[PDB]
Write a protein that binds this ligand. Sequence first.
Ligand code: HEC
Ligand code: SF4
Ligand code: SF4
Ligand code: F3S
Lengths: 456, 170, 56, 49, 174, 395
Amino acid sequence: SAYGKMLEELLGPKQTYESVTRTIGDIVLTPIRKTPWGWPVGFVIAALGLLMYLFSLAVLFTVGVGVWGINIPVAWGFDIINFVWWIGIGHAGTLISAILLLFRQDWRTSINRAAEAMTIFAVACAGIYPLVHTGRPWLDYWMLPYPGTLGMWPQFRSALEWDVFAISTYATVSILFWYLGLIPDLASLRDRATNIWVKRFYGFLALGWRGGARDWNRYEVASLILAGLSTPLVLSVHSIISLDFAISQLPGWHVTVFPPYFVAGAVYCGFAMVILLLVPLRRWYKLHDLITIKHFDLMGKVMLASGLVVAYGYFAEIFYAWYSANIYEYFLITNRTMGPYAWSYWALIVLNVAIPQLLWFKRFRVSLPWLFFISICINIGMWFERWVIIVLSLHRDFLPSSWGYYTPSVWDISLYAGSFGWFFFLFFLFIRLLPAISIFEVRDLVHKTETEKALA
Amino acid sequence: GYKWGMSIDLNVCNSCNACVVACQSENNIPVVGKDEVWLGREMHWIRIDQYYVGDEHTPNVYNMVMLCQQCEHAPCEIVCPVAATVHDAEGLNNMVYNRCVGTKYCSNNCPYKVRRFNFLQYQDVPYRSPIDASTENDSIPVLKMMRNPDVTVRARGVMEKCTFCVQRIN
Amino acid sequence: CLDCHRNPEKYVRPREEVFNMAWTPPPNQLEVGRRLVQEYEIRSSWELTNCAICHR
Amino acid sequence: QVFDRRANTLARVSIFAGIPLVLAILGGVWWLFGWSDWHRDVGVEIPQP
Amino acid sequence: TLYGLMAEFDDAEALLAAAEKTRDAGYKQFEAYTPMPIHGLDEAVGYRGTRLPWVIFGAGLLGASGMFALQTWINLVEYPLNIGGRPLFSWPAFIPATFEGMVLLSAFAAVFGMIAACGLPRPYHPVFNAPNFERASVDRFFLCIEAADPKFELKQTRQFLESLGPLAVSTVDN
Amino acid sequence: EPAALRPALGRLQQVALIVGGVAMLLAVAGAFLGAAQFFHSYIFAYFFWMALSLGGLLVLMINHLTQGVWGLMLRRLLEAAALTLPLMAILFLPIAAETLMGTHYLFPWTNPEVVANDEVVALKTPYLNVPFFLARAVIYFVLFIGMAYLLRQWSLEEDAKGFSDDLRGRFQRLSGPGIVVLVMAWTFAATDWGMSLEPEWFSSMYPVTYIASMLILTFGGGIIALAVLKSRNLLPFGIPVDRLHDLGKFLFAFVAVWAYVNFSEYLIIWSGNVPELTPWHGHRSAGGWEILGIVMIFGHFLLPFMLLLSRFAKRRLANLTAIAIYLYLIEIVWYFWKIMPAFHPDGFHIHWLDLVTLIAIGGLWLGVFAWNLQRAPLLAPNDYRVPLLRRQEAS
Ligand code: HEC
Ligand code: SF4
Ligand code: SF4
Ligand code: F3S
């Protein structure tokens, strides 16, 4: 069958419902003092990143927001380049979780929990940055519409107030669509426990689920609606993290194709992180029969299909910067190609629209040592896109007497390099305590391969 | 009622910088040390801009006295999440310091970049280096007398702006 | 003080009873307080709440 | 069996009697520390010299 | 104190054909209890869908019209501000904040409205005390009926479950 | 296969050339009363059937990249829409003739005294000039027709030889980089023909708002064409009720994309009101064009946002075409809001030449669309998804 030969590319060898539940219920329920190595040495490397995170924040609150190196021309720096980068990472974690669930696609099934959880920890690492880039961070509750004894409310015309409304909707429905997905899954880890103090842990995280058609029908009509509510959300969230440049009148910022080209770069940099995280989750956790290489052949095609929309984005915003007869957008082209930060835009054309244009060929998509180098050049490269958008439009602007430079200090590096600690502190807590693959959905994928072989 | 505007005759400005230092003495503007001027964090509500038009050996040098232009359709105001930058009905731009949470987005949308952020605790900076919090909320007692009692002596993370000397307007 | 700047007519008294401490607001405070606002040229709620009034 | 029958009383009132009381604690702390006339001491007769 | 007469099944190809056979047998109070969602079980049970998507829409119209009317009451009635020269009823710049309140209250009625429509915050269901319900969420499928229907005794039912293809018909308690 | 397919598609072909030819005989004879009013009303009618033809090419390339049972029902209808692009290359000649005539009706950068006064237009004369405007125009058409003819000669190969990855490899080898050089050949064509009518006004996202409406028109045309072919009992397959909910998912998720790229085009221009970006929405929100703006929020988005939310009126055929025909009559108003207020910018007016040229290019388009439906057997019977369409019909 033409449909059966699609579903057999996702699993591979002989697999039943128990052999699928066993190989995901052995990543979890393998007890401590029996837990395999790699996870101890990574959870204490992430602790040194978290103690670089919590020290750079304890510095930041005490001495101030001006240990970063942000100038007065360029007053948004690594606090915002890494914030749009981290928000950009978790967005393709919900293209995998929500947008592909609209398309009834079955190759999103095993990539689900390693993208639902990867969204959340790229938002908990992100969402600290709108709370700590403010100079007075103890008043970020003033960006909330609450009644007080002041008659003051937030503005609701600024696109940083909508960043409050986008992320505090994005952070809460990421942890409500990943926890709803874990309601029928932690009921399976509960029944495979045979240890009552880890059975009560997964017997209370899963609320008491039982299966049941009156609960399974209510689950998926609350899942695809949630997958239909998280799909205009993430096309809006990283559009709302895109409006807080495009609302501003700056020459490199006030372009109107920022809302679809940022979210294209979010499902470009984000698929690069799912590829950068799942290639070391097959070689280290033996998931060669669930994360089979057709999942990377399709994650590479969607990363390619998203990397052309930002290849379109770099050429449109360099066309309409010339097509506008402004001297300020004529200068924008001659400040990304020339000028002091021309190396950033040429390490952007190389790392985004030259090196991952090998994604057309299957030779650099099925080969994981080539898909890893391509995706590692997107995380470095899409950081440089958000550097070119933010810094190169800020550090040289309308008036020549306000031209700055923004060379970052150590506390801009230590907060960003410390932010990967808080990602992998929680990711390695997710791998150990929770399943990395949604067991009940891949049980349906095993059931879907059997029900199409029985149609012969 | 009381539409406030300003006319700066650029033909007669000799770049004497007496208006930079009189905004400093009137509006309690903090001095910033040499290490944080090189990072472009000088606190100066008004600035004079040389521009050097012509041949690189005999040029014409032109001054633009660039202060907060108090824009009617002010782009610095629409990008303030907590509305810490609004207008009067008198027409001038009100930068209220106690509401500023410190999101430097107003400075980015200000096209003239006449917004000036307190980055560290800029207070008595040539007498204590501003990279400590051992004396952040402790101030020199004799320097408190030079401050104008009608202008907010600003905190660590709020933004400044030329307020048309609104304490002299009011 | 914002409800009293946006609606001064429910609190404004005559200038001859300002320093009289025994002055209680009348049952007809409105149409008298509104009469005193247009008499004393008291500015509107737009011009009175824009943080150059306060907050210099 | 895990989570015996007495836990149904616990799981019912934790979302039906707990969360209206926790939000009544957090509604009263919001009143007392952000809205009350106690934290800005009215009627308190501040002692003079 | 008798809740069970629940039959273990091998695969769900033989469960939905038996669950729709229970619909032909007059039992109206019965469940499926599967490790995975099967296409055509609620059609076989007779659940006729749920009213849950209208709870999601009823709270989405309360978040869209509740956040758009929030920023309008702020900017027009509560504290109108000349901020940037922009109009008081800015009908743009209220839409990217009333959309994210539409997504928020819909999903707050999609997770907490699903675990309110299903009685999931409820440990000790009377079905968990089964001899092989540890396999119920892993491999096996458990057609189970209850004592809420007027046509259930221990006989008239156990012989009917053996007229199906079961693995182990076991009576579980409360 | 029904016997009444090729006569009724022959009848609809013949009656559309007479409807779309008399209305063009009414257009050029109506062009002689008011000369400029024709070209103001012609290029409005050109964009509605250029985008309905290019979206028929653009959804066809998405149909080749993905394995959908949807789209197999559209593949002979998208190919019947993609090869009306040879008609949109010969009906482009009245737009090409005005650039050669010294009238400056259509494009005001053809005027030498607009270039000589507006310096902003004079700096776009490297790009906006008639020996290079027409040379770019035939570059788009040889890329539009050539990516429609190659997607026809390889698809008529499929019902000739048979399905393999020798042939399905060629579809994805073309339609992979096809959409790249279809978007990029449209964001040079919508700044040529559509944005350059307002030559002082540049924009990003202005071709993208058309791209999200090329998906509305050709999924709306996906459901309208499978309605008349169902109502007259001419479809070779009964429509699966699950895959019409797919076409209604696409119609709904591209109304919402369209109202996200048109509103964020407005949200950016309204927020920072730069006077080189606001003249478009300032001419389109004043003098009667304010009425079509409020229509585009409510009648185009919010009325097909609510009725396209339930499964009812998305799973039923008779209540989805009540949205898809209504989305055509609200996109016709939208292309009248995109194109026409570039001419007579202060004030709203609509001529009878506006809605007799839409019939003129329309019946010409619907005749060539119906000419290419007799070429194909409407099923693509040697496809790989047609065993899945053999399923979902017997429940
Ligand atoms: C006079 C009627 C005022 C107007 C026009 C504004 N404010 Fe405003 N403010 C006023 C008073 C008497 C206080 C002290 C209240 C108290 O003791 O709690 C305040 C205080 C504030 C704050 C609180 C600062 C803090 O708690 O650290 C803020 C944020 C504030 N005021 C903001 C603000 C804004 C944005 C205004 C815009 C028009 C504004 N204020 C006007 C009195 C007045
Ligand atoms: S404007 Fe300033 S620099 Fe110019 S003359 Fe006056 S005080 Fe001197
Ligand atoms: S600070 Fe700049 S943007 Fe703000 S009102 Fe003054 S001139 Fe305008
Ligand atoms: S936008 Fe708003 S809160 Fe502070 S620094 Fe800028 S004012």
